[PDB]
């Protein structure tokens, strides 16, 4: 009897009567033997009632479990809610919402458990939220939406939805129009000037602009860039990119970063806890690695794994770390070529697509356009003529290097790594044009940047 259940749980009888009358509830209640949870879709109710239910979910949920327990004493009673009123979604501060059904969204910082995965901490943007998982799975670095009921500053998870590593932008017609206008113009120059507006920093800006547009899950797509200049100006650039433009990211001063602050830490203590380090938290975005000079070997190995394979590994646990590495190094005084002044081993240095030797509209719009471009054009591909343009550049440059070496002129080799970098940069520029087709024009822009890097390195 519904009235008796309502009374028992301190609910107005009408709350429970209106709930049980819903199509969502009746259909799922009939399907409960299949182990499927009973479902209440709140949109199937009066808006003020939907709101009241969300506010008082700590009361409603066990009442519903009790109702289903009557129908099926056989199985674990599970209840799900759908169609949260908008104000209960993506809650930025959970504590005032005690007792309420809510969703949070953000990046998993940490997980812990023993035999079972039990607890998580989620960075929702302004705060870190503790979560009791109740059998629901996720892992450090994952972006998630979690539906649950708040109980004393902890979210008791009801469901977990995996999300893309970067936020979704769904532009309206006016914004879509702005996007199309930006695409038609010269977005590369616009982004380049936004990033690095100082005289002489044109190529540097273009490199960093295209790096932003390489922030995608597909492993072979991401660009890694090393800035070589004075500390102050390089730090301002890294902070600027991360603060104002990056879709997602983390800044570290490598000198202040322990290896496990960079990768992840696994702690054993009456159970286990796994906490994401910087590269994992930067999954799908920019990892800004400041002060790379004298980077210790273990740190270099970690960075190389993230750069080459898009993972970090701690104790046999591989975590996604699909970050574009934006590093900075302070060289110095030596009348040797600029690249000779970089104190980093040759093998590590070759993992960067580009080295930028310094000295030789609304950010809202710019950032939202980037987010849009990445999600909408994750995988542009060479056209036939672009492939020919790329192969031609490559063969022509290899011949030139051979010739220059034959003349006794020190020159950097042009290898498969350079071919790969040009292709990545060209794909990034095609994303910047909101295109799925990489064209000869994209190859040309990419090749000019690789050539500039190769030439300036030795000048």
UniProtKB/TrEMBL annotation:
Residues 200-358 form the MCM C-terminal AAA(+) ATPase domain. SMART domains: MCM. Signal peptide: none annotated. One of its GO terms (cellular component) is MCM complex. One of its GO terms (molecular function) is ATP binding. GO terms for biological process: DNA replication. Keywords: ATP-binding, DNA replication, DNA-binding, Nucleotide-binding. It comes from the Archaea. InterPro entries: MCM, MCM_dom, MCM_lid, NA-bd_OB-fold, P-loop_NTPase. Belongs to the MCM family. This is Predicted ATPase involved in replication control, Cdc46/Mcm family.
């Amino acid at each position: 009897r519904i009235g008796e259940v309502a009374s028992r749980f301190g609910l107005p009888t009408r709350v429970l009567i209106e709930i049980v009358r819903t199509e969502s509830f009746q259909r799922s209640l009939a399907r409960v033997t299949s182990g499927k949870p009973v479902v209440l879709d709140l949109r199937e109710l009066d808006s003020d009632l939907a709101s009241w239910i969300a506010t008082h979910a700590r009361l409603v949920e066990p009442a519903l479990r009790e109702l289903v327990r009557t129908v099926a004493p056989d199985v674990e009673p599970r209840v799900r809610f759908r169609g949260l009123p908008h104000r209960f979604r993506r809650v930025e501060r959970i504590r005032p919402m005690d007792g309420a059904l809510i969703s949070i969204e953000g990046v998993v910082r940490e997980v812990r458990g023993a035999e079972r995965l039990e607890h998580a901490i989620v960075d929702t943007g302004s705060e870190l939220v503790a979560v009791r998982l109740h059998g629901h799975r996720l892992g450090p670095g994952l972006r998630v939406e979690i539906l649950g009921i708040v109980r004393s500053a902890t979210l008791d998870a009801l469901e977990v939805h995996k999300k893309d590593p970067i936020p979704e932008v769904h532009p309206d017609p006016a914004e879509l129009e702005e996007f199309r206008e930006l695409a038609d113009k010269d977005p590369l120059t616009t982004f380049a000037r936004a990033i690095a507006p100082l005289p002489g920093a044109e190529e540097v800006g273009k490199m960093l602009a295209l790096q932003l547009f390489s922030c995608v899950g597909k492993n072979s797509e991401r660009l890694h860039v090393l800035l070589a200049g004075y500390p102050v100006v390089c730090s301002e650039i890294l902070h600027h990119v991360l603060d104002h433009l990056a879709p997602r990211g983390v800044y570290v001063d490598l000198r202040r970063t322990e290896l496990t602050d960079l990768t992840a830490v696994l702690k054993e203590d009456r159970g286990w806890a796994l906490r994401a380090g910087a590269a994992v938290l930067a999954d799908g975005g920019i990892l800004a690695v400041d002060h790379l000079e004298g980077a210790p070997e273990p740190h270099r190995w970690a960075l190389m794994e993230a750069m080459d394979k898009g993972t970090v590994t701690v104790d046999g646990i591989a975590l996604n770390a699909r970050c574009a590495v934006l590093a900075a190094i302070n060289p110095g005084e030596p009348s040797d070529p600029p690249i000779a002044r970089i104190d980093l081993d040759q093998d590590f240095l070759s993992h960067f697509d580009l080295i930028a030797f310094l000295g030789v509209p609304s950010y809202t719009l710019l950032r939202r356009y980037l987010l849009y471009a990445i999600r909408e054009h994750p995988a542009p591909e060479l056209t036939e003529e672009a492939r020919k343009r790329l192969e031609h550049w490559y063969e022509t440059r290899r011949e030139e290097v051979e010739e220059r070496l034959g003349m006794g002129l020190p020159t950097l080799p042009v290898t498969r790594r350079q071919l790969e970098s040009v292709e990545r940069l060209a794909k990034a520029h095609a994303r910047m044009r909101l295109s799925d087709d990489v064209e000869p024009e994209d190859v040309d822009i990419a090749a000019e940047l690789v050539d500039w890097y190769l030439e300036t390195a030795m000048q």
